[PDB]
Design a protein around this ligand. Structure first.
Ligand SMILES: *[C@@H]1O[C@H](CO)[C@@H](O[C@@H]2O[C@H](CO)[C@@H](O)[C@H](O)[C@H]2NC(C)=O)[C@H](O)[C@H]1NC(C)=O
Ligand SMILES: *[C@@H]1O[C@H](CO)[C@@H](O[C@@H]2O[C@H](CO)[C@@H](O)[C@H](O)[C@H]2NC(C)=O)[C@H](O)[C@H]1NC(C)=O
Ligand SMILES: *[C@@H]1O[C@H](CO)[C@@H](O[C@@H]2O[C@H](CO)[C@@H](O)[C@H](O)[C@H]2NC(C)=O)[C@H](O)[C@H]1NC(C)=O
Ligand SMILES: *[C@@H]1O[C@H](CO)[C@@H](O[C@@H]2O[C@H](CO)[C@@H](O)[C@H](O)[C@H]2NC(C)=O)[C@H](O)[C@H]1NC(C)=O
Ligand SMILES: *[C@@H]1O[C@H](CO)[C@@H](O[C@@H]2O[C@H](CO)[C@@H](O)[C@H](O)[C@H]2NC(C)=O)[C@H](O)[C@H]1NC(C)=O
Ligand SMILES: *[C@@H]1O[C@H](CO)[C@@H](O[C@@H]2O[C@H](CO)[C@@H](O)[C@H](O)[C@H]2NC(C)=O)[C@H](O)[C@H]1NC(C)=O
Ligand SMILES: *[C@@H]1O[C@H](CO)[C@@H](O[C@@H]2O[C@H](CO)[C@@H](O)[C@H](O)[C@H]2NC(C)=O)[C@H](O)[C@H]1NC(C)=O
Ligand SMILES: *[C@@H]1O[C@H](CO)[C@@H](O[C@@H]2O[C@H](CO)[C@@H](O)[C@H](O)[C@H]2NC(C)=O)[C@H](O)[C@H]1NC(C)=O
Ligand SMILES: *[C@@H]1O[C@H](CO)[C@@H](O)[C@H](O)[C@H]1NC(C)=O
Ligand SMILES: *[C@@H]1O[C@H](CO)[C@@H](O)[C@H](O)[C@H]1NC(C)=O
Ligand SMILES: *[C@@H]1O[C@H](CO)[C@@H](O)[C@H](O)[C@H]1NC(C)=O
Lengths: 653, 200, 200
C-alpha cells in the first residue's frame, strides 16, 4: 500500500522543497512500509484549465490529500477555489498554506478544506483582547460590505455578545467606491474614540486619506487595523500612530510545507490503525461517488496535535482552521513599522518599546470624548416636574417658597402646539420642581452644562413592535435616549429589568412603589377578587407605555389584568387622575410617590392597599455610559448629607 | 447528534431518551435522517404524541420514501415537487426565454451570447448586469419566479406535505400568499409505531 | 469493558470517547485499572473536567502508585492505611487475645485449642461457637473492631484518600461514625500539566 499525497504550487522551486520535506517525513515514522509518495503540479492561468489539471495528475493518481499554496502576488480567493471544489467533490482533504480569505471557512461551500494559517476574520479576536487590556468599550466597526467585512463583523459581534457589551455602530463601506466621507462624518459625532477598520488595500488607503481630510487622526483617537491595512497602498497614506498587526510567518512557504506534511503523515499513521481504508477515486472520469474513507480521514486530521512543527504547535478548531497563532503588533512610528508586542494566543505580551498613539501622546488615551453640552429629556410629572408657560419675554413668573426661598427654574422646550394630533410646534416653557433641583445640583457637582427638553409623545416608554414589521422598537424617553436625541433622562423613571437591558440606571434617588387610587377604601392591593375578576362594575386603568404596563405585560399570572387594562389606558397621569376624580374611572394604578402626593394635595381621593411593586426612580443613561459612577456617587452623597430630605420637604410636603 | 453510516451508535440513544418535547424539528441529510428516525424508533420517539418536521434536506426522491420514515412526517416543498422532468425543463426554458424577451424589448436588441473559458471577463459587463436583472423578475403562467439577489426564489408558492398512512407523500396544505390552507382542522395521529401500546 | 491484556483495543477506545459524564466511577483490578486509565488519558478523560472514584480493589501498593493513575483519584480505605506491618500484627493478636480473655471471663476457662485437618468435627462444638461469638464484638484502643456475621469489619472509621499533585496518596477526609468530615471545602482540579486550574 503506497499512500500518495499531492501539492499544487507556483514557483517551480518550492516543489523541490516539498519533495525534500516529504522525503524527510518518510525517513521518520512508526511504519516505513506505507512508502509515503508525493506528487506536484504548477499553477495554471485559466481557472477551468486549472481544475482540469487537478482532475488529471493529482486526482488521476492515488492521492490521499492535496496541498495548495498562493503565488506571492496578491490574487485573493481565485487560485485555490478550483482545486478545493474538485477535491471536495470526492471529500479529499485540501490543506491551504497561504490563503487568508474567510470564504474557505464556510463548510457548506468548501466541504473538505483545512488550513494551517488563520484567516483575516480571526484578527478580530486579538482586538477583543486589546479591548480587554486597555478597558476600551466604545468602538466603531468600519468594515467593508464584501464577505470579508461581514465575516469579521460577525465574529467580533459574537465575541462581544459572549461578554456583556455591544459595538457602538458599524459602517458598511462598499468596496471600490469613492467618497467614504459620509461615514466618517457620521462617526465623528459619536462618543466613541476607537476606530476599527477591516478593508482591502485600496479601501484602507481611501479611508485613510478621507480621515486625514476630516482631521479624525488627531489626539484621543485610536486606530486598530489588520494585515491588509498596513501593507501595499495602505501603508503609504496610513496615518502615524495606528496599531496594526501581522502574522509571524505569513508567507514562509517552506515552513508551512514542512509543518503540513508532518501533520498529514501523523494523521495517516494515526488512522491507519483502524484500517478500513478505501482507495481514492483514481481519476475524475469513471467515478461519481465520494471516497468513503475521506470524511473519516478529514475528521481525524482535524484533531491532530502536531506539536513539533516549524511554526509551533498545530491544532485545528471545529471549522478546520489553525487554532492558535502569533500576531506581531505593529505601530507606525515616524513612517516606520515598529513591533511592540506579540500575541501568544490568549494574551498580548508587551516586552519592549512604547506605543506611540496617533496624536503623539505617550500616555494611553481613554476611548471616549464625552461632551460638555448635554441634552437632557424630561416628562411632566406634577410632584417632580412642574411645567409652566413662559411670559412673552422668554422667562416665566418669578416665585418663592412659603419659607421664603427662591425657586430655581430652567428653560425647557415642550410639545406646546395649537395644532391637534401630534405635537407640531416645540414652544418653550419653564420647568422646575424636584427633578430639576436634583439636576441643578448634579450639574453643579459634576461640572457640565445642560439643555432640558420635554419628551415628544408624553410617554415614559416601552418597547413595542414597529408597524409594518416584526421587530420591537422603543418609544418615549426610552426611545429618545437609545436613539441619541437625549443624552440623559432626569425624570421619575422606574427601574425595571426590561429597561436595564438597554439603559444604564444610576443608584435610586427615590424609593417608592405601586399603589391604587380611588375616590374617597374597599380595595386591598392587586389581590382583591374584584381586580382578579374583571367586569364593567369595577373599571381600572393605568398610563399607556409606562412601567406598570410592562409590569403587567411581563406577568403570566396577571394576563387577564393586562387584558382588561388594555381597553381603558390613558394618555397621561394627570388626565387619569382628573377622570378618576370626576367619577369616570374607578381605580387608577400608579406610583406611590405621585399618587400619595396627589391624594395629600388635592384630597377627595384615597390610596388603598400596600405597595405591591417596590422600586426606585433612577437617572437613565445610554448603555455603559462613562460617567455613570460619578452620578451614582453624587446621588449617594445627596442621600447622606441632607439634600434628599430638603428636596422632600420643599416639594412633596 | 452525531449520525452517519454506522458511526458511534451510542451517545445518541442516551440524549434522545431525555428530550421531553411533543413536537420535534429535525435538520439532517437523507442518510442521516434515516439513521435518526431509526434511532428515535428505538428510543420511543415516533408515533402519536410526537410530530416531526423536516426541510427538503431529509426528503430524497419523494416518489418513493424509505421505510424508516415515520408516518406523520411533515415537510415543506415547492409547488413543482409533483411536476415531471419535461415540465420543469419547459419552465426553465420559459424563464430564460422571458428574460431574453424582456431584455430585447427594453434595449431593442437580442441578448449577447456568452463566451468560453479563454480570456476570462473579469469585471461584469454592463450588458451582463442588465440581462441578469431582467432575468431576475419574471412571472410565468400565474406562478411568480422572482429571484432573490442571493440566487434562490423569493415568495414562491410553497406546499406543506406529509407522509400518510399508506406511506405516500401527499399534499396537506398550501402557502400561496402569506396565508395557510390546511386541510386538517385537527392534526391526525395513527396507530403506526405503537408496538408497545404505551406509546399511545 | 474487557480491560484484558492483548485484546480488542478499538472497542474500549470507542466506548470511552462516547462518555461525557463529569463524574466517573470505575471498578476493576490493579492491572485493569492501569489499562483503563491509560485508555482514558488517550481518550481525554483525565483533565480537570473529570473526577474519578475507585474502591479499594483498583488500588494496589499505596506507597508506590503507578504513573497511569490520574491526579485527583479518590478512594476510601480503613485506618490500616499507612500503618506498619508490626502494628497490624499487634492489632490482630490483640483482637484474638481480648476475645480469649472475654471467653475466660464469661466461662471461667480458656477456649479449646484447634484440632487438625486429618479429621472432620461435624458437630458445631458450641464452645467454639461461643468463642467465635465473643470474638465478633471487641474494641481495642478506642477503636471499634466489631465484625458483621458475614465475617467483615462492620461500622469502622474509614478515611477518604486522594492522589495529590506530588503523586502521593494524601488523606482527604474521614468517616467517623455515620458522619463525614473532609479537609477541602471545595475540590481542587489540576490541569493536564499539573497546573492548578480554578473554575471561572
Ligand atoms: C510516486 O510519485 C511519482 C511522482 O512523480 C509518480 O510518478 C508519476 O507517475 C504518473 C503516473 O504513472 C506519471 O504520469 C508521471 O509522469 C510520473 N512522474 C514522474 C516524475 O515520473 C509515481 O507514479 C508514484 N508512484 C506510484 C503512484 O506508485
Ligand atoms: C462626497 O459627496 C458629498 C455630497 O453630499 C460632498 O459633500 C460636499 O462637499 C463640499 C466640499 O467638500 C462642501 O462644500 C459641501 O457642503 C458638501 N455637501 C454636503 C451635503 O455635505 C463631499 O465633498 C464628497 N466627497 C468627495 C471625496 O467627493
Ligand atoms: C522560513 O523560516 C525558516 C526557519 O524559521 C528559515 O530557515 C532559516 O534559513 C536561514 C537561511 O536561509 C538559516 O540560516 C536558518 O538556520 C534557518 N532556520 C533554521 C531554524 O534552521 C527560512 O529561511 C524562512 N524562509 C523565508 C523565505 O523567510
Ligand atoms: C508563539 O511563539 C511562542 C514562543 O514564545 C511559541 O511557544 C513555543 O511553544 C513550543 C510548543 O508549545 C515550545 O516547544 C517552545 O519552547 C515555545 N517557545 C518558547 C520560547 O517557550 C508558540 O508555540 C507560538 N505559537 C504558535 C501557535 O506556534
Ligand atoms: C469646569 O469646566 C470648565 C470648562 O471645562 C473649566 O474651565 C476651564 O478651566 C481651565 C483651568 O481650570 C482653563 O484653562 C479653561 O480655559 C477653562 N475653560 C472655560 C471655558 O472656562 C473649570 O475649571 C472646571 N471646573 C473645575 C475643574 O473645578
Ligand atoms: C468621577 O469623579 C471623579 C472625581 O472624584 C473623577 O476623577 C477625576 O477626573 C478628572 C477628569 O476626568 C481628573 O482630571 C482627575 O485627576 C480625577 N481625580 C482623581 C482623584 O483621579 C472622574 O473622572 C469622574 N468620572 C468620569 C467618568 O468623569
Ligand atoms: C423587471 O425588472 C426590470 C429591471 O429591474 C424592469 O425594467 C425596467 O423597465 C422600466 C419601464 O418598463 C424602465 O423605465 C427601467 O429603466 C427598466 N429597468 C432597467 C432597464 O434596469 C422591468 O420593467 C421589470 N418587469 C416588469 C414587468 O415591470
Ligand atoms: C461481646 O458480645 C457478647 C454477647 O454478644 C458479650 O457477652 C455477653 O456478656 C454479658 C455480660 O453482662 C452476658 O450477660 C451475656 O450472657 C454474654 N453473652 C454471650 C453470648 O457471651 C461480650 O461481653 C461482648 N464483649 C465485650 C468485650 O463486652
Ligand atoms: C471496518 O469494516 C468492517 C467491515 O468491513 C466493519 O464490520 C467494522 O465495524 C469497521 N470498523 C470500523 C469502521 O472501525
Ligand atoms: C403655547 O402654544 C399656544 C398656541 O400656539 C401659544 O398661544 C402659547 O403662547 C404657547 N405658550 C407659550 C408659553 O408660549
Ligand atoms: C401600518 O401597518 C398596517 C398593517 O397592520 C398597514 O395597513 C399600514 O399601511 C401601515 N402604515 C404605515 C404608515 O406603514
Amino acid at each position: 500500500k503506497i499512500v500518495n499525497i499531492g501539492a499544487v504550487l507556483s514557483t517551480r522551486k518550492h516543489e523541490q522543497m516539498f519533495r525534500e520535506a516529504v522525503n524527510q517525513a518518510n525517513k521518520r515514522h512508526g511504519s516505513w512500509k506505507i512508502q509515503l509518495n508525493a506528487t506536484s503540479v504548477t499553477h495554471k492561468p485559466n481557472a477551468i484549465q486549472m481544475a482540469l489539471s487537478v482532475c488529471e495528475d493529482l486526482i488521476s493518481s492515488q492521492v490521499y490529500a492535496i496541498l495548495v499554496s498562493h503565488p506571492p502576488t496578491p490574487n485573493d480567493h481565485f487560485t485555490p477555489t478550483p482545486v478545493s471544489y474538485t477535491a471536495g467533490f470526492y471529500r479529499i482533504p485540501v490543506l491551504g498554506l497561504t490563503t487568508r480569505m474567510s470564504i474557505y471557512s464556510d463548510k457548506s461551500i468548501h466541504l473538505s478544506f483545512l488550513r494551517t494559517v488563520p484567516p483575516y476574520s480571526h484578527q478580530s479576536s486579538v482586538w477583543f483582547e486589546m479591548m480587554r487590556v486597555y478597558n476600551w468599550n466604545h468602538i466603531i466597526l468600519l468594515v467593508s460590505d464584501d464577505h470579508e467585512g461581514r465575516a469579521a463583523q460577525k465574529r467580533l459581534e459574537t465575541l462581544l455578545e459572549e461578554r456583556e457589551s455591544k459595538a457602538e455602530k458599524v459602517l458598511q463601506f462598499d468596496p471600490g467606491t469613492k467618497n467614504v466621507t459620509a461615514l466618517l462624518m457620521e462617526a465623528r459625532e459619536l462618543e466613541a474614540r476607537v476606530i476599527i477598520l477591516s478593508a482591502s488595500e485600496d479601501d484602507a488607503a481611501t479611508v485613510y486619506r478621507a480621515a486625514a481630510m476630516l482631521n479624525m487622526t488627531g489626539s484621543g483617537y485610536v486606530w486598530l487595523v489588520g494585515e491588509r491595512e498596513i501593507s501595499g497602498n495602505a501603508l503609504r497614506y496610513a496615518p502615524d500612530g495606528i496599531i496594526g498587526l501581522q502574522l509571524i510567518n505569513g508567507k514562509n512557504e517552506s515552513a508551512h510545507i514542512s509543518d503540513a506534511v508532518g501533520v498529514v503523515a501523523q494523521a495517516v499513521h494515526e488512522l491507519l490503525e483502524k484500517e478500513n481504508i478505501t482507495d481514492p477515486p483514481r481519476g475524475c472520469v469513471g467515478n461519481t461517488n465520494i471516497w468513503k474513507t475521506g470524511p473519516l480521514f478529514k475528521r481525524v486530521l482535524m484533531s491532530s496535535k502536531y506539536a513539533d512543527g516549524v511554526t509551533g504547535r498545530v491544532e485545528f478548531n471545529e471549522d478546520g482552521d489553525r487554532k492558535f497563532a502569533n500576531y506581531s503588533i505593529m505601530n507606525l512610528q515616524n513612517r516606520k513599522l515598529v513591533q511592540v508586542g506579540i500575541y501568544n494566543g490568549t494574551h498580548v505580551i508587551p516586552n519592549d518599546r512604547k506605543i506611540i498613539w496617533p496624536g503623539g501622546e505617550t500616555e494611553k488615551p481613554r476611548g471616549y470624548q464625552m461632551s460638555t453640552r448635554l441634552k437632557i429629556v424630561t416628562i411632566h410629572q406634577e410632584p417632580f416636574v412642574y411645567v409652566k408657560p413662559t411670559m412673552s419675554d422668554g422667562t416665566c413668573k418669578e416665585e418663592f417658597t412659603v419659607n421664603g426661598d427662591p425657586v430655581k427654574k430652567v428653560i425647557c422646550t415642550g410639545p406646546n402646539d395649537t395644532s391637534p394630533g401630534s405635537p407640531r410646534h416645540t414652544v418653550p416653557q419653564c420647568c422646575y420642581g424636584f427633578c430639576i433641583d436634583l439636576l441643578i445640583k448634579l450639574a453643579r457637582t459634576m461640572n457640565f452644562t445642560y439643555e432640558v427638553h420635554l419628551v415628544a409623545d408624553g410617554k415614559f416608554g416601552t418597547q413595542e413592535r414597529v408597524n409594518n414589521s416584526n421587530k420591537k422598537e422603543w418609544n418615549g424617553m426610552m426611545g429618545e435616549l437609545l436613539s441619541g436625541q437625549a443624552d440623559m433622562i432626569v425624570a421619575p423613571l422606574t427601574i425595571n429589568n426590561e429597561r436595564a437591558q438597554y439603559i444604564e440606571f444610576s443608584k435610586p434617588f427615590k424609593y417608592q412603589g405601586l399603589t391604587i387610587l380611588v375616590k374617597k377604601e374597599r380595595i386591598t392591593g392587586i389581590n382583591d377578587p374584584r381586580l382578579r375578576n374583571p367586569s364593567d362594575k369595577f373599571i381600572y386603568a393605568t398610563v399607556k407605555q409606562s412601567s406598570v404596563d410592562i409590569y403587567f405585560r411581563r406577568q403570566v399570572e396577571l394576563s387577564t389584568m393586562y387584558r382588561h387594562m388594555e381597553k381603558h389606558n390613558y394618555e397621561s397621569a394627570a388626565e387619569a387622575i382628573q377622570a378618576v376624580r370626576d367619577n369616570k374611572l374607578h381605580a387608577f394604578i400608579w406610583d406611590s410617590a405621585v399618587l400619595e402626593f396627589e391624594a395629600s394635595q388635592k384630597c377627595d381621593l384615597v390610596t388603598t392597599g400596600e405597595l405591591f411593586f417596590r422600586s426606585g426612580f433612577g437617572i437613565g443613561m445610554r448603555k455603559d455610559s462613562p460617567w455613570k459612577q460619578n452620578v451614582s456617587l453624587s446621588i449617594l452623597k445627596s442621600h447622606e448629607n441632607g439634600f434628599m430630605e430638603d428636596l422632600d420637604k420643599t416639594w412633596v410636603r | 447528534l452525531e449520525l452517519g453510516p454506522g458511526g458511534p451508535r451510542a451517545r445518541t440513544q442516551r440524549l434522545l431518551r431525555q428530550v421531553d418535547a411533543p413536537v420535534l424539528v429535525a435538520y439532517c441529510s437523507r442518510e442521516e435522517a434515516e439513521v435518526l428516525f431509526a434511532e428515535a424508533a428505538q428510543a420511543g420517539l415516533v408515533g402519536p404524541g410526537h410530530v416531526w418536521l423536516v426541510p427538503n434536506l431529509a426528503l430524497g426522491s419523494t416518489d418513493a420514501p424509505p421505510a424508516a420514515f415515520p408516518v406523520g412526517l411533515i415537510s415543506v416543498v415547492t409547488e413543482s415537487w409533483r411536476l415531471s422532468l419535461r415540465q420543469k425543463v419547459r419552465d426553465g426554458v420559459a424563464i430564460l426565454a422571458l428574460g431574453a424577451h424582456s431584455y430585447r424589448r427594453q434595449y431593442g436588441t437580442l441578448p449577447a451570447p456568452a463566451g468560453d473559458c479563454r480570456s476570462h471577463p473579469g469585471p461584469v459587463s454592463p450588458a451582463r448586469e442588465a440581462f441578469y436583472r431582467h432575468l431576475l423578475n419574471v412571472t410565468w403562467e400565474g406562478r411568480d419566479f422572482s429571484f432573490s439577489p442571493g440566487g434562490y426564489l423569493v415568495r414562491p408558492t410553497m406546499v406543506v406535505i406529509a407522509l400518510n398512512r399508506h406511506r405516500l407523500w401527499e399534499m396537506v396544505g398550501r402557502w400561496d400568499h402569506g396565508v395557510l390552507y390546511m386541510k386538517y382542522p385537527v392534526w391526525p395521529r395513527y396507530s403506526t409505531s405503537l408496538q408497545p401500546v404505551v406509546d399511545s
